[PDB]
Symmetry: C3
Amino acid sequence: MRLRISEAVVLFLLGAVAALIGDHSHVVTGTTVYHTDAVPFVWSSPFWFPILVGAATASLAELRLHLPAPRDGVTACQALGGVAAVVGTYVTTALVHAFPVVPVTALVAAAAAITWCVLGDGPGAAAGVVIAVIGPAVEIALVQLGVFAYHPDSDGLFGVAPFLAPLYFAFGVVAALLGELAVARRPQL
Amino acid sequence: MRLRISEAVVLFLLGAVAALIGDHSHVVTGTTVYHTDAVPFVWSSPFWFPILVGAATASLAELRLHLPAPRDGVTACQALGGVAAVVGTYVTTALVHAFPVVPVTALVAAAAAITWCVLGDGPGAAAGVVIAVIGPAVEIALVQLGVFAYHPDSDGLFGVAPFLAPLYFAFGVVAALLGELAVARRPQL
Amino acid sequence: MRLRISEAVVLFLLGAVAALIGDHSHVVTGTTVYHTDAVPFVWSSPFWFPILVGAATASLAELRLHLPAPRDGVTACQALGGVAAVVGTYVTTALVHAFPVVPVTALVAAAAAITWCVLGDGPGAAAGVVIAVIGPAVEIALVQLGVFAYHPDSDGLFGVAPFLAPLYFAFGVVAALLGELAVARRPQL
Ligand SMILES: CCCCCCCCO[C@@H]1O[C@H](CO)[C@@H](O)[C@H](O)[C@H]1O
Ligand SMILES: CCCCCCCCO[C@@H]1O[C@H](CO)[C@@H](O)[C@H](O)[C@H]1O
Ligand SMILES: CCCCCCCCO[C@@H]1O[C@H](CO)[C@@H](O)[C@H](O)[C@H]1O
Ligand SMILES: CCCCCCCCO[C@@H]1O[C@H](CO)[C@@H](O)[C@H](O)[C@H]1O
Ligand SMILES: CCCCCCCCO[C@@H]1O[C@H](CO)[C@@H](O)[C@H](O)[C@H]1O
Ligand SMILES: CCCCCCCCO[C@@H]1O[C@H](CO)[C@@H](O)[C@H](O)[C@H]1O
Ligand SMILES: CCCCCCCCO[C@@H]1O[C@H](CO)[C@@H](O)[C@H](O)[C@H]1O
Ligand SMILES: CCCCCCCCO[C@@H]1O[C@H](CO)[C@@H](O)[C@H](O)[C@H]1O
Ligand SMILES: CCCCCCCCO[C@@H]1O[C@H](CO)[C@@H](O)[C@H](O)[C@H]1O
Ligand SMILES: CCCCCCCCCCCCC(=O)O
Ligand SMILES: CCCCCCCCCCCCC(=O)O
Ligand SMILES: CCCCCCCCCCCCC(=O)O
């Protein structure tokens, strides 16, 4: 693989911490509710949740490095700004989840579009699309299995929130950027 | 005129679609209520609403092309980012309309100022001012005619929301940018 | 001092006006409540409030000019954009203060991180840290003295809101930028 193990671990941990903050926000606001008492929880989340998101973060970063022309000009502040945009968008969905589906979903889509315009490229959008499909699909399956549920006013996408599509998209764009950064920041001559 | 017909039509449709999303958001949250049952509606809006906003979008873009030095360096992502900023701001007003007038209006003004700082120029601000006056004036007349009304906690500007001023301003800045883009993206040598 | 008196006065007034808008927003939404009837108020604030924040604005700008390499390339739109970001963040805290502490605090921290990534430098972050400590410390003392109080759902940081830390941080970053601008905009050859 193109990421070094240490880089993959840092990205995994980054994704895990951001996931725990966002998922705690969803749980405490009632955006989601878990129904899986048999597993160990970490904060408000089943232990496998930050592992799934952390693994997705490292995986999408790796994916970008297999797509054409990773950008060598990516900076730490672009990456910090991107992580902040995704986390801010994530927690915002917790704050506004009880509002009507159209303005809520449009707001998240606007945040995701702006994130991509500022920070992303073509391959980054591709990674964004991959997880914007896979992310919600995994959630839909987990919800049908009774593992957790969304609030009834935020479950319009086959049991899950429509805002997941642009939320995951923005996540993929930023994870891709993190992969580019991991390579770019290596020692140079 | 400086826009080609095809460009004017694309801008018209862009404005119309964004208007329908924002206006649906206002209606469904109770920010506004229509009182005009005799006309055909499109989604939540009287059919003439997206036509008015769509026409304003093409008109403000055209206006910019008659003002000094349209920028040749405008990009599709600046335009996408600007449309996203205006739509995100529009739907946000639907979410926060019931809150006190000062923080609500200040929030929209901040979003509009940031939009202009990132994307706008002097002539763009001029176009912004034109519609920040005309937009609210048209709405005030329509409200006095009983065509629609604002929620009583969002009607402080002669029957309409004070946030319309910075919302329309941001709209004008972005419409101007769309006009610059329409010309810039034409085939080059 | 490095600021000229006229520059320091403009920064003082800028900070004072922004403070009055943000503090009115906190009072009218019930984020905070004053308990000091014996002093003259200006709008919703004790007269000393805009003086404290105004003085802090000029002071942090001055501080930046004593730190390494003030940037000569700072622009008026960066400064306007930064002031808008801080004011927008400030009024947003008034709108969301009743929500759970983690998503509220994370949202403000994201806004502050993005503000710094876009506009700040190392010394700007240093100024940010200084006031992110001093600001909340002053408030904690004032609250223990019974001068004002936070809403019970926004008082987790020794009687004050945890969001003050990233809010003041963003304030310091932007005040520092204003100091750089004051020098940069002086007449050139
Ligand atoms: C992109 C998000 C941050 C990832 C950075 C942490 C990954 C660690 O990566 C390692 O860092 C070392 C010290 O700089 C370097 O010597 C190695 O070349 C590099 O692989
Ligand atoms: C990397 C993704 C997780 C790796 C370890 C898999 C742990 C799965 O654990 C499973 O979780 C379910 C929901 O909580 C429970 O219903 C199952 O009984 C439990 O076995
Ligand atoms: C919506 C997402 C916003 C992300 C904001 C980060 C944008 C970074 O912006 C740029 O980043 C580079 C790294 O410092 C620097 O060269 C520039 O000074 C900075 O303006
Ligand atoms: C600014 C918002 C997008 C407007 C773009 C659509 C307008 C269509 O405009 C036309 O597009 C053709 C195909 O590229 C070109 O050959 C023509 O020169 C151009 O006028
Ligand atoms: C381009 C702007 C609209 C062009 C067609 C004008 C249609 C106006 O239609 C009018 O709308 C009013 C409010 O709904 C009604 O009160 C009037 O009875 C109706 O005739
Ligand atoms: C508040 C409004 C935010 C609009 C964000 C769009 C800013 C665009 O930002 C810049 O746009 C250009 C077009 O891709 C590119 O050259 C740059 O890579 C990109 O950072
Ligand atoms: C950084 C926020 C804005 C501060 C600008 C106002 C400070 C006034 O500053 C003065 O302005 C004069 C007129 O331009 C100049 O001739 C002086 O050199 C300058 O010191
Ligand atoms: C620059 C900072 C303020 C300068 C003037 C100091 C005015 C302080 O005034 C004090 O304010 C307190 C709270 O309102 C009251 O409890 C005190 O009785 C009052 O004297
Ligand atoms: C979160 C804080 C966002 C602040 C947005 C302001 C960023 C300014 O952005 C840049 O500012 C310079 C001054 O005009 C110009 O050279 C550029 O055209 C403009 O894009
Ligand atoms: C860039 C770092 C982001 C890490 C967090 C990514 C979150 C992706 C969205 C997860 C949504 C999970 C859910 O709503 O149940
Ligand atoms: C850049 C594209 C934006 C199209 C939408 C522009 C909206 C302008 C504001 C319309 C407000 C109408 C109302 O609140 O009744
Ligand atoms: C850049 C100009 C910003 C001026 C306003 C700065 C506000 C700093 C935060 C003050 C918070 C006061 C309070 O919540 O009581």
